[PDB]
RNA sequence: UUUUUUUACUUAUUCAAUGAAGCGGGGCUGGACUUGCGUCCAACUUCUGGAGUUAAGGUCC
């Protein structure tokens, strides 16, 4: 049995009755200027009309194809510092015993990176697959690169994460990565990935990449326009 | 390299892409301080040909002056 | 002078219902011909009470409850938006825009007459003390009544000392030397 | 309903093409005032 | 209302009747399903037909899983028209 | 395709307020008209110079 001395004291939170309870005022927080600036920058980029060469970067590889591309490219990460030291030690022993360094070291297969290097490989038509980060600032560093790949007949794909490409290339950030050639045990996987990119990304973004981006209205503007058009239809 | 493409694109200041980028960057730099630090050059080809290097000891400061 | 004579900020309570305040003091404001009323309201968001300073309408008294908001009654001292008052009502401290806390009809004996309404596009036609006709948003607030202290200028000042005492707390230029009493270097009327 | 079936199909398509981490955790702020966080000195 | 029939090909080994039904029941209700198989060996011919109760659900699933890279196979998912669906397509389903 | 007019919008710019506190769109309840169920409009405190603040309580653990 409950104590009869216990009582309920409900609070009426109407206008002019009780002190208002502490609510979630997160929609109305006076934010710091850097947070406000980045949010309004994103909002303004949505509100203005985006030319197609910039708006094409909104179309990106999906989760499955990005995971398959990273599953292939994780086998071809560049040589680390300790591995390079061990290789140089083996080559030094080979020189000491009087052999060429090519007699002890094998031809490497790595993911090619660096923006100038990748652009040179695309111009020389040596790249087999190009992955371009979707968030490069300034955007002019990569805004020509889909058109360059289309001119050279190179399969390209826009992918989420310059940091994600940096994890491939042991860096914080990579703007673009390229595959030129792989080993014989991964040639089939590379060809299947290239065909998958061609059939599931490029053919789907062939028509959307030529359109303008942005032009979206805010929430209150959309609601005002809906009220206006229903008012006009009723009247 | 890419910087040749950036040079030829930066020549075309009246194109749609460059015009949009200039508009949004003008808005952002107007909301920022009169003198503030840029974390990286917004025109890397121009900075590189004027002598900027990605080395500890090189800084970029963005400034606006009344015309 | 301690505090300016302004309404409360336009908040949720005044926009949707009403809030009650109590008149604690009616005080003389140096340099102003109209008395001021200190009114204490509750804060809806905290325990501490908030004290405001209004221009006192004639008939207001200490210990009186006044009500400010959309649903407030049509009574002297109450603050209502002009959309909630009928035509012909006289009001004081009328806002030009909702939230400027009072701009029109503020001196002693003066008021603003609510001439008409346009509910279709949300405006209110009013008549100012100068006789001008103005159109203001209907959600602009006004205190019902006439500013206290009317007939102040009916009495002659009768003395240079009384004029001096009037203007010394008012910072107006007194005494006033005529332009034609001046040298040509001082005034265009000089000479 | 047809709207419910369509919503189920859209949710399945979203899960297939983007994953299941569709939501984010956001702090509740009782005040409109932001303070500088206290860091190690 | 109108039922929907989806033809799916390039099936990887292991992606069979129960796997298909369980996967596409997330998209919507499946009324019929048949994987084309050889009668001499019982082995799958890497193609199947799925008959959903709802055509819009079938269409959404087909656009979702078209060109999907699964176990080295780029899946084919198309919607067959009601004019070109066969009356005896789901015999033995 | 370009040039004028007027005629809407908001994203530049401008003004004002606030402790950036309740804006916009829905849902619940009631009232009306309507059509035979869509709108708009209202939720909450008015006899008194008192007091109102540290959540009471419900329900799963």
XYZ file of C-alpha atoms (C1' of nucleotides) in Angstrom:
688
model
C 0.000 0.000 0.000
C 1.194 3.498 -0.887
C 1.678 6.197 1.732
C -1.473 8.353 2.128
C 0.787 11.350 2.862
C 1.998 11.370 -0.752
C 0.346 14.028 -2.906
C 0.348 15.066 -6.557
C 1.199 18.694 -7.378
C 0.626 19.072 -11.137
C 1.895 22.199 -12.865
C -0.215 24.050 -15.418
C 2.180 25.316 -18.084
C -0.329 27.608 -19.771
C 0.191 31.289 -20.422
C 0.656 33.209 -17.193
C 0.187 30.329 -14.760
C 3.472 28.631 -13.862
C 7.153 28.939 -14.672
C 7.835 27.264 -18.007
C 9.813 24.000 -17.827
C 13.272 23.637 -19.300
C 12.724 22.577 -22.914
C 15.005 21.704 -25.809
C 15.886 25.138 -27.217
C 18.462 23.723 -29.639
C 16.692 25.176 -32.685
C 17.173 28.675 -31.229
C 20.692 28.504 -29.763
C 22.895 31.525 -30.457
C 25.679 29.577 -32.143
C 29.317 30.659 -32.475
C 30.204 32.447 -35.687
C 32.216 29.604 -37.233
C 29.363 27.109 -36.764
C 26.883 29.665 -38.114
C 29.183 30.367 -41.077
C 29.605 26.722 -42.084
C 25.864 26.036 -41.772
C 24.907 29.092 -43.828
C 27.592 28.184 -46.379
C 25.992 24.763 -46.889
C 22.539 26.379 -47.006
C 23.626 28.991 -49.574
C 25.195 26.320 -51.782
C 21.826 24.566 -51.753
C 19.808 27.751 -52.382
C 21.820 29.057 -55.332
C 21.872 27.416 -58.763
C 24.938 25.193 -59.168
C 26.496 24.849 -62.656
C 26.719 21.240 -63.917
C 30.522 20.935 -63.680
C 30.234 21.474 -59.919
C 26.844 19.793 -59.456
C 28.120 16.536 -60.978
C 30.004 15.795 -57.745
C 26.733 15.237 -55.864
C 26.396 11.902 -57.692
C 28.617 9.341 -55.994
C 29.284 5.595 -55.847
C 26.903 3.648 -53.646
C 27.873 1.724 -50.515
C 28.342 -1.676 -52.168
C 30.431 -0.491 -55.123
C 32.539 1.766 -52.897
C 33.155 -1.189 -50.568
C 34.173 -3.408 -53.500
C 36.527 -0.741 -54.869
C 38.119 -0.341 -51.442
C 38.337 -4.124 -51.007
C 40.354 -4.300 -54.221
C 42.455 -1.203 -53.522
C 43.352 -2.236 -49.965
C 45.570 -4.990 -51.409
C 47.663 -2.380 -53.260
C 48.452 0.146 -50.538
C 51.830 1.906 -50.909
C 54.951 0.728 -49.141
C 55.279 1.829 -45.529
C 58.343 3.271 -43.816
C 59.432 0.071 -42.045
C 58.865 -1.982 -45.204
C 60.957 0.478 -47.217
C 63.745 0.268 -44.619
C 63.706 -3.542 -44.802
C 63.759 -3.454 -48.614
C 66.669 -0.995 -48.610
C 68.543 -3.219 -46.144
C 68.052 -6.231 -48.429
C 69.196 -4.187 -51.435
C 72.251 -2.997 -49.482
C 73.148 -6.612 -48.699
C 72.689 -7.467 -52.389
C 75.065 -4.655 -53.412
C 77.535 -5.792 -50.734
C 77.486 -9.370 -52.044
C 77.771 -8.014 -55.577
C 74.278 -8.369 -57.029
C 71.924 -5.871 -58.630
C 69.033 -4.540 -56.569
C 66.670 -5.856 -59.252
C 67.941 -9.359 -58.449
C 66.579 -9.093 -54.888
C 63.611 -6.719 -55.361
C 60.465 -7.327 -57.405
C 58.488 -4.864 -59.526
C 55.924 -3.161 -57.257
C 52.202 -2.735 -57.812
C 50.682 0.115 -55.802
C 47.773 2.530 -55.921
C 48.908 5.671 -57.733
C 48.156 8.974 -56.017
C 49.058 12.639 -56.042
C 46.991 14.965 -58.221
C 49.720 15.960 -60.699
C 50.931 12.357 -61.013
C 47.404 11.042 -61.631
C 46.671 13.783 -64.189
C 49.888 12.873 -66.007
C 48.928 9.187 -66.000
C 45.472 10.017 -67.396
C 47.038 12.180 -70.116
C 49.420 9.330 -70.984
C 46.400 6.939 -70.894
C 48.144 4.641 -68.410
C 45.451 4.776 -65.711
C 42.887 1.970 -65.729
C 40.582 3.357 -63.028
C 40.298 6.807 -61.426
C 38.613 7.530 -58.090
C 37.991 11.208 -57.325
C 37.070 12.569 -53.899
C 33.719 14.354 -53.719
C 34.822 17.021 -51.201
C 37.890 18.736 -52.663
C 38.277 22.383 -51.610
C 39.105 24.289 -53.862
C 36.848 22.414 -56.288
C 38.814 23.664 -59.321
C 41.512 21.063 -58.605
C 39.144 18.288 -59.755
C 36.412 20.104 -61.711
C 38.079 19.330 -65.066
C 38.984 15.747 -64.182
C 35.729 13.936 -65.179
C 35.894 15.693 -68.562
C 39.569 14.736 -68.891
C 38.701 11.104 -68.142
C 35.852 11.197 -70.678
C 38.184 12.611 -73.343
C 40.876 10.007 -72.658
C 38.370 7.151 -72.329
C 39.305 6.414 -68.709
C 36.780 4.859 -66.296
C 36.303 7.262 -63.404
C 34.120 7.355 -60.316
C 33.386 10.025 -57.726
C 33.721 8.595 -54.217
C 32.911 9.892 -50.731
C 35.958 10.728 -48.645
C 39.270 12.370 -49.337
C 40.140 11.090 -45.860
C 38.946 7.678 -47.047
C 41.411 7.826 -49.947
C 44.067 9.062 -47.524
C 43.584 5.864 -45.532
C 44.512 4.004 -48.722
C 47.602 6.099 -49.389
C 48.770 6.442 -45.725
C 47.860 10.140 -45.668
C 45.292 12.350 -43.992
C 43.783 13.300 -47.356
C 44.032 12.263 -50.997
C 42.187 14.221 -53.673
C 42.373 11.447 -56.281
C 43.710 7.904 -56.627
C 44.368 5.807 -59.704
C 44.877 2.159 -60.579
C 47.146 1.607 -63.587
C 47.939 -2.112 -63.355
C 47.478 -4.892 -60.807
C 48.862 -8.388 -60.336
C 47.718 -11.351 -62.413
C 45.684 -12.791 -59.539
C 43.741 -9.499 -59.307
C 43.372 -8.717 -63.030
C 39.942 -10.396 -63.087
C 38.841 -8.446 -60.006
C 40.041 -5.185 -61.564
C 38.201 -5.925 -64.821
C 35.012 -6.824 -62.943
C 35.287 -3.631 -60.885
C 35.816 -1.569 -64.055
C 32.768 -3.151 -65.706
C 30.729 -2.656 -62.521
C 31.693 1.028 -62.417
C 30.876 1.466 -66.126
C 27.463 -0.195 -65.877
C 26.364 1.030 -62.444
C 27.764 4.543 -62.102
C 28.605 6.095 -65.465
C 25.503 4.996 -67.379
C 23.332 6.153 -64.476
C 25.014 9.574 -64.162
C 25.275 10.094 -67.941
C 22.093 12.189 -68.042
C 22.154 13.666 -64.519
C 25.681 15.102 -64.828
C 24.480 17.581 -67.474
C 21.857 19.176 -65.213
C 22.087 22.166 -62.901
C 22.197 21.679 -59.145
C 20.771 23.637 -56.261
C 17.713 25.828 -56.598
C 16.018 24.245 -53.573
C 13.834 26.451 -51.379
C 13.782 26.622 -47.609
C 11.096 24.975 -45.503
C 9.048 28.110 -44.824
C 9.382 29.262 -48.442
C 8.088 25.900 -49.690
C 5.172 26.043 -47.246
C 4.340 29.619 -48.297
C 4.432 28.582 -51.959
C 2.169 25.583 -51.275
C -0.309 27.797 -49.414
C -0.205 30.282 -52.304
C -0.829 27.646 -54.981
C -3.673 25.978 -53.067
C -5.166 29.437 -52.446
C -4.964 30.185 -56.179
C -6.461 26.792 -57.065
C -9.325 27.271 -54.598
C -9.950 30.836 -55.796
C 49.768 18.462 -63.860
C 46.494 20.002 -62.725
C 47.897 23.514 -62.280
C 47.967 24.158 -66.034
C 44.231 23.406 -66.079
C 43.731 25.685 -63.068
C 45.610 28.458 -64.898
C 43.486 28.147 -68.035
C 40.313 27.984 -65.935
C 41.313 31.012 -63.839
C 41.692 32.957 -67.073
C 37.952 32.402 -67.750
C 36.584 34.560 -64.946
C 33.264 35.283 -66.703
C 32.270 31.628 -67.082
C 29.425 30.113 -65.074
C 31.550 27.866 -62.835
C 34.139 30.520 -61.963
C 31.392 33.127 -61.536
C 29.475 30.909 -59.084
C 32.645 30.108 -57.125
C 33.569 33.800 -56.961
C 30.070 34.676 -55.720
C 29.999 32.105 -52.909
C 33.592 32.844 -51.878
C 32.864 36.587 -51.842
C 29.951 35.942 -49.487
C 32.083 33.764 -47.187
C 35.028 36.187 -47.101
C 32.619 39.043 -46.400
C 31.208 37.164 -43.402
C 34.751 36.494 -42.136
C 37.049 39.100 -40.585
C 38.721 41.925 -42.507
C 42.086 40.233 -41.890
C 42.065 36.502 -41.208
C 44.258 33.479 -41.822
C 43.646 31.119 -44.729
C 44.465 27.514 -43.864
C 45.416 26.878 -47.502
C 45.560 29.049 -50.637
C 42.259 29.258 -52.495
C 44.234 29.737 -55.744
C 47.043 27.160 -55.415
C 48.444 27.686 -58.926
C 48.656 31.460 -58.428
C 50.235 31.047 -54.985
C 52.724 28.480 -56.308
C 53.796 30.667 -59.225
C 54.178 33.629 -56.856
C 56.390 31.458 -54.646
C 54.250 29.708 -52.029
C 55.424 26.250 -50.975
C 53.729 23.605 -48.827
C 56.477 23.849 -46.221
C 56.483 24.834 -42.552
C 57.160 28.566 -42.562
C 54.771 29.653 -45.336
C 51.447 31.191 -44.308
C 48.527 32.715 -46.214
C 46.504 35.643 -44.898
C 43.280 36.780 -46.542
C 42.447 40.479 -46.364
C 39.760 42.810 -47.691
C 40.301 46.519 -48.370
C 37.764 49.214 -49.198
C 38.011 50.222 -52.838
C 15.889 59.689 -15.266
C 16.454 56.003 -14.480
C 14.867 53.842 -17.198
C 13.281 54.547 -20.589
C 9.509 54.422 -20.967
C 9.008 51.339 -23.143
C 6.625 48.408 -23.377
C 7.644 44.848 -22.654
C 9.314 42.942 -25.494
C 6.705 41.201 -27.619
C 6.809 37.615 -26.373
C 4.718 34.436 -26.477
C 2.416 35.533 -23.644
C 1.538 38.874 -25.227
C 1.266 37.330 -28.696
C -1.129 34.519 -27.741
C -2.802 35.384 -24.418
C -2.283 38.010 -21.731
C 0.023 38.641 -18.780
C -0.894 40.556 -15.620
C 1.262 43.233 -14.040
C 0.833 45.346 -10.924
C 1.370 49.115 -10.782
C 3.688 49.848 -7.850
C 4.680 53.503 -8.308
C 3.624 56.591 -10.238
C 6.672 58.842 -10.449
C 7.696 62.169 -11.927
C 10.170 61.999 -14.813
C 12.561 64.982 -15.014
C 12.271 66.665 -18.393
C 9.037 64.841 -19.264
C 5.618 66.408 -18.795
C 3.995 62.984 -18.373
C 4.243 60.810 -15.245
C 5.649 57.297 -15.472
C 4.229 54.101 -13.989
C 6.421 51.287 -12.692
C 4.678 47.955 -13.313
C 5.928 44.561 -12.112
C 5.230 41.449 -14.193
C 6.149 37.810 -13.723
C 8.770 36.170 -15.860
C 7.197 33.092 -17.505
C 10.607 31.379 -17.714
C 12.117 32.067 -14.282
C 11.306 32.802 -10.657
C 12.515 36.417 -10.638
C 9.995 39.209 -11.227
C 10.508 41.800 -13.977
C 9.833 45.517 -13.474
C 8.866 47.694 -16.445
C 8.368 51.430 -16.957
C 5.330 52.641 -18.898
C 3.957 56.078 -19.621
C 1.120 56.489 -17.132
C -2.337 56.914 -18.615
C -4.784 59.136 -16.774
C -6.817 57.142 -14.274
C -4.076 54.626 -13.485
C -3.243 54.202 -9.805
C -0.895 52.329 -7.497
C -2.072 48.824 -6.646
C -3.904 48.424 -9.959
C -3.634 45.284 -12.072
C -3.113 45.932 -15.776
C -3.132 43.282 -18.480
C -0.944 43.139 -21.580
C -1.555 40.776 -24.461
C -3.856 39.703 -27.255
C -6.673 38.554 -24.950
C -6.496 41.537 -22.585
C -9.672 43.438 -21.775
C -10.536 46.854 -23.211
C -9.700 48.812 -20.059
C -7.564 51.867 -19.228
C -3.946 50.877 -18.648
C -4.206 47.616 -20.572
C -1.846 47.050 -23.502
C -3.456 45.468 -26.562
C -2.556 45.026 -30.220
C -4.560 47.321 -32.471
C -6.213 44.301 -34.101
C -7.999 43.597 -30.791
C -9.476 47.085 -30.290
C -12.650 48.457 -31.921
C -12.751 51.536 -34.115
C -12.843 54.885 -32.334
C -10.756 53.641 -29.403
C -8.066 56.074 -28.282
C -4.685 54.565 -27.407
C -1.228 55.741 -26.378
C 2.422 54.717 -26.849
C 1.487 53.204 -30.205
C 4.123 51.125 -31.970
C 4.972 51.964 -35.567
C 6.084 48.348 -36.031
C 5.330 45.403 -33.714
C 8.223 45.200 -31.272
C 9.580 48.756 -31.149
C 7.880 49.131 -27.719
C 6.056 52.418 -28.345
C 6.650 55.455 -30.543
C 3.417 57.387 -31.128
C 1.315 59.517 -28.798
C 3.609 59.774 -25.785
C 3.382 63.337 -24.439
C 0.895 64.558 -21.849
C -2.734 64.789 -22.926
C -2.064 63.140 -26.295
C -3.415 59.962 -27.857
C -3.848 58.120 -31.151
C -7.318 57.366 -32.524
C -7.991 53.999 -34.166
C -9.813 55.004 -37.354
C -10.201 51.729 -39.216
C -9.104 48.188 -39.983
C -8.101 46.185 -43.067
C -8.197 42.552 -41.877
C -7.721 41.120 -45.381
C -4.156 42.441 -45.600
C -3.598 43.009 -41.870
C -3.369 46.775 -41.370
C -4.877 49.466 -39.160
C -5.545 53.090 -40.069
C -4.886 55.509 -37.207
C -5.054 59.256 -36.603
C -2.065 60.928 -34.944
C -2.144 63.974 -32.617
C -0.885 66.154 -35.491
C -3.978 65.189 -37.505
C -2.016 62.967 -39.881
C -3.378 59.613 -41.025
C -1.085 56.608 -40.791
C -1.274 52.910 -41.653
C 0.412 50.555 -39.186
C 0.538 46.766 -38.787
C -2.435 45.489 -36.813
C -0.235 43.635 -34.306
C 1.350 46.883 -33.096
C 0.460 47.394 -29.447
C -1.039 50.372 -27.658
C -2.072 51.290 -24.132
C -5.779 52.046 -23.814
C -6.428 55.634 -22.830
C -4.954 59.136 -22.730
C -1.524 60.087 -21.389
C -1.783 61.721 -17.972
C -0.843 65.328 -17.293
C -3.004 67.073 -19.874
C -3.488 70.813 -19.755
C 0.151 71.390 -18.774
C 0.696 74.093 -21.409
C -2.531 75.947 -20.546
C -0.815 77.634 -17.596
C 1.479 80.554 -18.498
C 5.089 80.148 -17.414
C 4.972 83.813 -16.314
C 8.666 83.984 -15.328
C 12.094 83.647 -16.895
C 13.056 81.515 -13.892
C 10.237 79.068 -14.581
C 11.270 78.819 -18.233
C 14.885 78.298 -17.099
C 13.823 75.544 -14.695
C 11.776 73.967 -17.491
C 14.668 73.869 -19.950
C 17.658 73.232 -17.649
C 16.511 69.646 -17.033
C 15.480 69.411 -20.693
C 18.902 70.519 -22.179
C 17.152 72.730 -24.772
C 18.838 75.985 -25.734
C 17.757 78.712 -23.302
C 18.010 81.734 -23.399
C 17.531 82.314 -27.145
C 19.316 85.230 -28.816
C 17.689 86.530 -32.000
C 19.533 86.336 -35.303
C 18.836 89.983 -36.139
C 20.333 90.931 -32.757
C 23.644 89.423 -33.916
C 26.623 90.546 -35.968
C 26.780 89.528 -39.664
C 29.620 87.084 -38.914
C 27.423 85.080 -36.534
C 24.094 84.686 -38.345
C 22.726 85.218 -41.867
C 20.069 87.386 -40.195
C 22.875 89.294 -38.433
C 22.833 93.039 -39.010
C -1.931 0.418 -47.259
C -0.314 1.386 -50.558
C 1.507 4.269 -48.858
C 2.847 1.886 -46.198
C 4.008 -0.613 -48.841
C 5.698 2.177 -50.787
C 7.382 3.464 -47.627
C 8.646 -0.053 -46.874
C 10.065 -0.301 -50.401
C 11.752 3.111 -50.098
C 13.249 2.157 -46.727
C 14.557 -1.129 -48.152
C 16.086 0.705 -51.128
C 17.702 3.258 -48.805
C 19.133 0.488 -46.622
C 20.469 -1.358 -49.672
C 22.076 1.696 -51.280
C 23.336 3.607 -48.218
C 23.342 1.387 -45.112
C 21.560 1.325 -41.774
C 23.230 4.228 -39.918
C 20.483 6.625 -40.962
C 20.252 8.581 -37.699
C 22.466 10.842 -35.613
C 22.582 11.734 -31.924
C 22.064 15.424 -31.134
C 22.536 17.160 -27.781
C 19.584 18.666 -25.934
C 20.311 22.281 -24.966
C 18.170 23.806 -22.207
C 19.632 27.278 -22.853
C 20.210 29.429 -25.926
C 23.635 30.421 -24.555
C 26.762 28.695 -25.867
C 29.810 28.605 -23.593
C 33.426 27.950 -24.485
C 34.239 24.369 -23.387
C 36.665 23.923 -20.520
C 39.870 22.340 -21.795
C 43.064 21.151 -20.144
C 45.441 23.896 -18.993
C -3.343 -3.779 -57.341
C -1.458 -4.922 -60.427
C 1.166 -7.585 -59.659
C 4.754 -7.153 -60.758
C 7.158 -9.652 -62.347
C 10.926 -9.139 -62.122
C 13.504 -11.165 -64.042
C 16.834 -11.456 -62.221
C 19.979 -12.902 -63.801
C 23.723 -13.203 -63.172
C 22.912 -15.025 -59.935
C 26.025 -16.009 -57.956
C 26.268 -19.521 -56.581
C 24.358 -19.706 -53.307
C 21.849 -16.962 -54.123
C 18.873 -19.295 -54.494
C 15.140 -19.546 -53.695
C 15.242 -19.033 -49.919
C 17.901 -16.304 -50.107
C 15.923 -14.459 -52.802
C 12.645 -14.714 -50.887
C 14.228 -13.555 -47.635
C 16.054 -10.668 -49.289
C 13.173 -9.307 -51.355
C 10.577 -9.818 -48.617
C 12.293 -6.802 -47.055
C 11.254 -4.832 -50.142
C 7.755 -6.267 -50.294
C 5.437 -9.243 -50.268
C 6.456 -12.005 -52.686
C 3.592 -14.101 -54.024
C 5.567 -16.341 -56.398
C 9.224 -17.141 -57.075
C 10.995 -19.640 -59.323
C 14.685 -20.200 -60.080
C 15.338 -21.775 -63.477
C 17.105 -25.108 -62.990
C 18.337 -28.003 -65.109
C 16.211 -31.129 -64.759
C 19.126 -33.484 -65.444
C 21.353 -32.266 -62.589
C 19.271 -29.925 -60.421
C 21.828 -27.137 -60.847
C 20.704 -23.533 -61.204
C 20.939 -21.751 -64.552
C 21.759 -18.426 -62.804
C 18.359 -16.839 -63.509
C 15.058 -16.490 -61.684
C 11.646 -14.839 -61.808
C 10.031 -13.128 -58.809
C 6.342 -12.200 -58.829
C 5.544 -9.470 -56.273
C 2.043 -8.504 -55.197
C 2.760 -4.847 -56.002
C 4.171 -3.503 -59.261
C 5.628 -0.328 -57.725
C 7.443 -2.437 -55.112
C 8.782 -4.677 -57.888
C 9.893 -1.611 -59.870
C 11.652 -0.073 -56.842
C 13.428 -3.360 -56.076
C 14.505 -3.725 -59.716
C 16.007 -0.231 -59.843
C 17.638 -0.856 -56.460
C 19.347 -4.130 -57.386
C 20.033 -3.461 -61.069
C 23.800 -3.658 -61.804
C 24.546 -4.777 -58.227
C 28.022 -6.296 -57.845
C 27.535 -9.464 -55.784
C 30.274 -12.107 -55.350
C 31.910 -11.194 -58.645
C 28.566 -11.029 -60.472
C 26.957 -7.815 -61.712
C 23.294 -8.661 -61.133
C 20.645 -8.125 -63.806
C 17.237 -6.990 -62.520
C 14.550 -6.029 -65.037
C 10.771 -5.677 -64.885
C 8.978 -7.695 -67.540
C 5.830 -6.089 -68.998
C 2.431 -7.679 -68.306
C 2.081 -8.029 -72.078
C 5.292 -10.082 -72.292
C 4.962 -12.104 -69.070
C 4.223 -15.726 -69.929
C 1.056 -17.413 -68.573
C 3.075 -20.537 -67.656
C 6.078 -18.652 -66.253
C 5.518 -19.732 -62.635
C 4.601 -23.385 -63.105
C 6.536 -25.354 -60.512
C 7.196 -22.257 -58.399
C 17.499 34.952 -79.203
C 17.680 39.969 -77.463
C 15.511 44.874 -75.492
C 11.589 47.417 -72.542
C 7.261 47.242 -69.000
C 5.058 45.195 -64.485
C 4.969 41.207 -61.129
C 5.857 37.759 -57.969
C 10.060 35.187 -55.155
C 14.716 35.105 -51.830
C 19.822 33.803 -51.713
C 23.136 39.221 -51.931
C 22.550 43.811 -49.377
C 19.705 46.899 -45.548
C 16.769 47.837 -40.729
C 15.024 46.312 -35.843
C 14.433 43.021 -31.415
C 15.769 39.226 -27.912
C 18.792 36.173 -22.108
C 18.642 34.601 -30.147
C 11.903 31.139 -25.830
C 8.174 28.949 -28.016
C 8.664 30.543 -35.791
C 6.587 27.255 -39.751
C 3.949 22.614 -40.929
C 1.261 18.631 -38.786
C -1.218 15.650 -34.741
C -5.056 15.848 -30.191
C -9.700 18.543 -28.345
C -13.786 21.919 -28.970
C -16.616 25.541 -31.956
C -18.505 27.059 -36.425
C -19.675 27.109 -41.486
C -19.371 24.062 -45.450
C -19.599 20.181 -48.461
C -21.789 15.889 -46.718
C -15.671 16.619 -44.494
C -12.355 20.722 -46.631
C -11.238 25.196 -44.402
C -10.435 29.112 -40.175
C -10.106 29.784 -35.135
C -9.593 28.812 -30.292
C -6.991 26.308 -26.675
C -3.630 28.597 -21.267
C -4.289 32.834 -16.099
C -9.421 39.060 -14.810
C -13.413 40.961 -7.560
C -8.742 41.753 -4.133
C -1.264 45.878 -3.429
C -0.671 37.589 -0.755
C 2.366 33.569 -2.534
C 4.415 31.026 -6.921
C 11.571 28.919 -7.374
C 15.241 22.908 -5.260
C 9.312 18.429 -10.086
C 5.326 16.264 -7.289
C 3.515 12.008 -9.373
C 2.582 7.736 -12.926
C 4.937 3.472 -15.179
C 9.082 -0.118 -16.411
C 13.588 -1.721 -14.309
